[PDB]
Design a protein around this ligand. Structure first.
Ligand SMILES: CCCCCCCCCCCCC/C=C/[C@H](O)[C@H](N)CO
Ligand SMILES: CCCCCCCCCCCCC/C=C/[C@H](O)[C@H](N)CO
Lengths: 58, 252, 275, 178, 178, 252, 275, 58
């Protein structure tokens, strides 16, 4: 029941092993490898979107 | 051009000719509550024409020394038709909104408003270990007013523009769904605001969902022959309003 | 593995395209890249927004309170201590949580217990190892009113026992709210007539901890001081908001004295003079 | 001016000759007193290293009948502060013409020795100077107010990063919050 | 009446006009004094959160020649307690006609803000009021007793739940049981 | 057997055990208004749970000398929840009804009621060339009472049972949708009543749609030891109620 | 993964079906759903009856008794202690077990031992670490009558040895009954002539524990107090019964003083007045 | 000799690993994941069952 995933290494130059030991999901370690984002709801939060080269309020 | 916008909700229509755009929340458009996110078990009430329509609040006067204004918004519509009646007869409410603010001038007037729509604007007190009365947080369709300096009234909100009643930097208050009314380009500011809460439905008297704030950064200024009286008019329309838990009328 | 955006090369331009001209009145933040205004080269950028995520920003252990209690006293209330659980008595973890309005996280609780021999005439003792008890009471349970009280039995309440000199005690705690998120701010009242208390104090309701010595009356007083460390893990967060400018005053309300927006400069234009 | 809302207003008006300095500050998002308590300054004050570009947006809040031009210059360090408009246009700048589109963007390019600066102040990673000058004056017609107000905005670009966690130097408590 | 078996008997009889209140209590299975020591109140007093619907069953224990009608109303909070039969029929109710089938069911619908209430008392999760009124009077023939007795039942529906373990507040011992 | 009947409309349920049947109007079941028979042009309001539900009126006492009772029925529900509020905020209303009347006794009591549901029961006056006040035609949820003889009160209806307030034979009053409550077989009388008018929608304050009449033909009678107080309870539920022409609250 | 029942939508009804009319005289609980009386919507319900099962309700550690003994005394009986094993001297675990008539479970036993230096003139000592011994005697075995008695050898009896400062001692115990379930209630006598003792005291017969210090006579008295924690696991339970209203009196019988059925109201109808 | 089974997680949004170490079944952990029930012997404990829409004592 082991899971293998890559480590946080640098660029231009791994594979740790994890087994869960407790019956509950509140015992698991922190999910410190989710690096995704989406600033489309804070920047650009408008109807009838803008095309960045048009005068846009033309 | 895209400066002309028309909005129809019910038997009420707003036509504008110097609009800017429409900000829609955090990208989410107001919709009804699905069966997976539901908690209550009985049939809701969806009036959809007699409720979802534009209501016009009081106009406020904008002098050269004006500081700002706020309205609490599930409570400013307490006495506005069948929306307010449906608030009075049910226990659980849930709606989104459309906030349209009118202010006009000429090409010789200058000024710049910031229209913010802030969720959970829990406000501070003028005296720190003192309880605020409900007539100062909200007054219905009548606006409450910020002050320029440190206010110290009894049972009142700390009224200073540079802390917005919340203890934050007023310049950083643009993280929320906002627009500007700049008097050389704009005439109006439309903000579509969805339902934001920690629970799927809530009571519309015990809770304050959000707070509209209209704060003039660039102060109003004009010459010695121009018009002095410049009003500011707020119009609100509930969207996808539904109601749950019918019982007798009251709030206690 | 999510990199930041590369910088693309550009050349001279002369056209009716205007990336630098926009309108901030629409509530829109312009998406202007440095290759839209000036001539840039090609930069293959390998930076990662890794240590700025909401998981890595909040998941650090923070002291929330200090709890003090003794092992022999004339009054029985100073031999045990209690704490109504909040995260709003230390300003660092409070200000780190108040970037958002609603949060959803599991908690990892760690206690650090230290004992100091109090000043007395009979300090020359030989004390065996002190054992401490930390009982958590969910909201509504019975309250111990003495150190020898029979409500310390922990038949159903969670508890932890620690002998002096070991590792700190650590346990995990799931998401315990009756709603869908821990509401950091509650703009509203407690009663339906819009009276009562105003603020987040209605929605705390988390229970409270209890602390004593499992050992009996010793022949010399010893003051234990235990420090509670929360660690928010498995983090989700919604609807951000500006950080607080002003210094806090209390735990139950949000009230303040007004503070200036920033530090003054005394001039407005820079120069190569004494700036 | 910090105990009011006048701290956000950049005063601008008709000049007598030309070419004077409007405002000026140092590019330190988190150490400069100007953008210290700003949102980028707060989040960067929870970190110790930063990297990437910075957008500055300027909104003209005057009247529809007023015109004007400005020079929005960025100057990398090594020399000092530019002392006139002649020294200011030798660096990265933009001429902004005020018309129907009410806001301009000065996008400060990432020009650095290393990959990261420091958020606190040191001589090694110094970043430069933001300055603003009169290209042409503010010409206004009769029966219109002369003195107007510029507002300023800041945000980060899509290549921006922060690296080292630390506690913010703004939190100062003495006792508990009983 | 608790130190007898008369605490279970709900007195009911012929009235003079109409429309009076028979009994009434608050929907708190585990905090109300009415359904505290009941079986649902015991099991719910070993828990701290509860959720789901509740059945109330009413048995008429009078005579076979007696007739009557009742209004079994549930009213969600937000207002107060309904003060007459006019305010009581504006909520969830049922008219029960007493005939051959001797028992009726008022199934209290789960109507709540959250997913769970609290078993102990708080202002936030308040649930409402169970009340009972005379629809029509008890008409009885001659040589038959007038005053009769209603019995009441409670149980949980098939969508019911409990969440948080705790000790019951009913156990109170002082010494051991030598 | 078919004597047990259960009716659910909303969050209110009636279970009866000595019912007789259910009379449905003139065969027509209450439905909404189609687009071909419509007159008004705007969107109607269909609450459908907060409106369509059983409301309980006042109980009346039936002595041995009782003569009869009547209720006008778009007006007896003026102060009954969101039905009455939706009456107060709109101009045009349209609904059908379900009228359930409770009266119980024992097997030693005797008597017989006639429950009639009469459209357009335009009533006469006690003094012939005199105007009737509105408090005597209707009183809301409080019943008006017939008299045994020729009544001659001021500004009042001619109250005689043998003319039913309309000048007709009271025995011929069974041409309308009716049932009987005979105390040796029955316990209740359910009448489903559709919308009957000369126009598709109408105002629910200026018009009286119908009149329930409960008249005891066989007088109430019992022995010297039986129960004296026998109430009569009327419960009404609007069906397919829709509303048109929203404006401010009032009636003038 | 077993969910609770969904709420199905319904509309208006007018028919001879009567879900609300029933007869409770048949000992039958009506199966009426809220979609049988009022109009309901469709609710997809995700609640799980998880923390209400008989395993999760009973499997919590509970203090059953406190055992006290010393390390030097004038009388030899106060230097050791014994306990006849029952679960009926603490009311919480007793009332949690007495929901059912018969039970079948494995036991998990945990001891928590604390020592306190008694008051004397020579408290300034240097005591090496105390070692305790807990011997279990199955029913019929020989009984130690002193701390130095030779019946403490544990050649066949189960035992456990604990040095001060470690983790609490824990061992597992299987189902030990001579019948098919632990009978919580026994309505019957001990003798066939219907005399003797009446109650569950005939069917206890579980053995008894013994406690002493492995160390010899020390030069200062120290009072040890060890607490026994039972944990019922692998649980099966049959034929439920109502919880006890009345306060307990003894361990061997079921006797009581009569208690009122619930708390009084002083009125019978609610109102919007002071209720 | 390992056994893999799912953890107790919430709805709308695992796989711990267990190996038994002792020779006896009385040493095993608590079986805290049996969520089944049957209230047909406590509710509805009758002969000639009832159909919930019929008068049932008709
Ligand atoms: C002795 C074993 C159990 C230890 C119990 C320690 C703490 C129990 C409570 C869990 C911690 C929740 C703390 C509060 C979380 C949220 O931040 C606040 N509700 C406000 O957001
Ligand atoms: C020193 C190692 C062995 C430790 C022995 C400790 C306890 C031995 C007895 C097993 C526990 C059974 C306790 C009683 C179980 C039932 O609840 C009762 N018979 C009544 O139901």
């Amino acid at each position: 029941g082991a899971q293998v995933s890559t480590q946080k290494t640098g660029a231009h130059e791994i594979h740790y092993t994890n087994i869960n030991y407790y019956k509950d999901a509140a015992s698991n370690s922190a999910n410190r490898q989710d690096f995704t984002q989406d600033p489309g709801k804070f920047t650009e939060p408008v109807k009838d979107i803008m095309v960045k080269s048009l005068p846009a309020l033309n | 051009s895209d400066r002309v916008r028309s909005i129809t909700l019910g038997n009420s229509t707003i036509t504008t000719q110097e609009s800017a755009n429409v900000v829609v929340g955090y990208g989410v458009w107001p919709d009804y509550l699905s069966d997976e996110e539901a908690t209550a078990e009985d049939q809701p009430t969806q009036p959809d024409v007699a409720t979802c329509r534009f209501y016009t609040l009081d106009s406020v006067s904008w002098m050269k020394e004006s500081q700002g204004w706020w309205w609490k918004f599930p409570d400013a519509l307490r006495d506005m038709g069948l929306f307010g009646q449906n608030m009075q007869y049910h226990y659980l409410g849930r709606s989104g909104y459309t906030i349209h603010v009118q202010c006009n001038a000429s090409k010789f007037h200058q000024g710049c408003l910031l229209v913010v729509c802030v969720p959970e604007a829990e406000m501070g007190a003028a005296n720190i270990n003192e309880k605020i009365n409900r007539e100062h947080l909200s007054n219905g369709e009548v606006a409450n007013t910020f002050s320029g300096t440190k206010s110290s009234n009894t049972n009142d909100v700390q009224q200073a523009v540079f802390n917005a009643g919340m203890g934050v930097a007023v310049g950083n208050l643009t993280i929320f769904p906002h627009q500007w009314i700049n008097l050389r380009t704009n005439n109006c500011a439309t903000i579509v605001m969805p339902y934001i809460n920690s629970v799927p439905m809530d009571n519309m008297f015990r809770h304050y969902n959000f707070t509209l704030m209209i704060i003039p950064f660039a102060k109003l200024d004009y010459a010695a022959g121009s018009s002095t009286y410049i009003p500011i008019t707020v119009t609100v329309a509930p969207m996808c309003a539904e109601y749950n838990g019918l019982r007798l009328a009251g709030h206690q | 593995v999510v990199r930041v955006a590369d910088t693309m090369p550009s050349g001279p331009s002369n056209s009716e395209s205007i990336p630098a001209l926009t309108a901030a009145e629409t509530g829109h933040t312009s998406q202007v890249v440095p290759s839209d205004t000036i001539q840039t080269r090609h930069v293959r950028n390998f930076h990662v927004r890794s240590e700025s995520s909401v998981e890595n920003f909040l998941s650090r252990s923070a002291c929330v309170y200090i709890v003090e209690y003794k092992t022999r006293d004339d009054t029985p209330d100073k031999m045990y201590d209690s704490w109504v659980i909040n995260t709003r008595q230390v300003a660092q973890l409070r200000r780190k949580l108040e970037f958002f309005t609603y949060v959803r996280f599991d908690v990892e609780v760690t206690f650090v217990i230290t004992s100091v021999q109090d000043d007395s005439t009979r300090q020359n003792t030989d004390t065996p190892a002190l054992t401490h008890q930390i009982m958590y009471v969910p909201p509504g349970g019975p309250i111990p009113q003495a150190v020898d009280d029979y409500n310390w039995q922990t038949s159903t309440n969670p508890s932890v026992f620690w002998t002096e000199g070991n590792a700190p005690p650590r346990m995990s705690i799931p998401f315990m709210s009756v709603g869908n998120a821990y509401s950091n701010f509650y703009d509203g009242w407690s009663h339906f007539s819009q009276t009562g208390v105003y603020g987040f104090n209605t929605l705390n309701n988390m229970g409270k901890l209890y602390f004593r010595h499992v050992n009996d009356k010793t022949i010399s007083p010893i003051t234990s001081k235990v420090r509670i460390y929360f660690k928010p893990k498995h983090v989700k967060a919604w609807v951000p908001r500006p950080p607080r400018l002003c210094e806090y005053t209390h735990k139950d309300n949000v009230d303040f004295e007004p503070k200036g927006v920033t530090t003054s400069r005394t001039q407005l234009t820079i120069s190569n003079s004494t700036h | 001016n910090v105990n009011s809302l006048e701290a956000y207003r950049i005063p601008v008006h008709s000049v007598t000759e030309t070419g004077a300095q409007v405002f000026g500050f140092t590019l330190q998002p988190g150490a400069d007193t100007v953008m210290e308590r700003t949102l980028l300054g707060e989040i960067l004050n929870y970190y110790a290293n930063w990297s990437g570009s910075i957008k500055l947006t300027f909104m003209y809040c005057g009247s529809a009948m007023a015109t004007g031009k400005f020079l929005l210059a960025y100057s990398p360090p090594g020399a000092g502060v530019p002392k006139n408009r002649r020294e200011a246009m030798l660096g990265t700048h933009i001429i902004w013409d005020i018309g129907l589109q009410s806001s301009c963007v000065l996008c400060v390019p990432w020009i650095s020795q290393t990959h990261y600066r420091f958020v606190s102040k040191d001589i090694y990673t110094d970043a430069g100077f933001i300055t603003c000058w009169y290209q042409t004056s503010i010409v206004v017609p009769a029966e219109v107010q002369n003195q107007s107000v510029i507002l300023c905005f800041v945000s980060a670009c899509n290549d921006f990063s922060v690296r080292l966690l630390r506690d913010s130097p703004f939190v100062r408590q003495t006792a508990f919050y009983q």
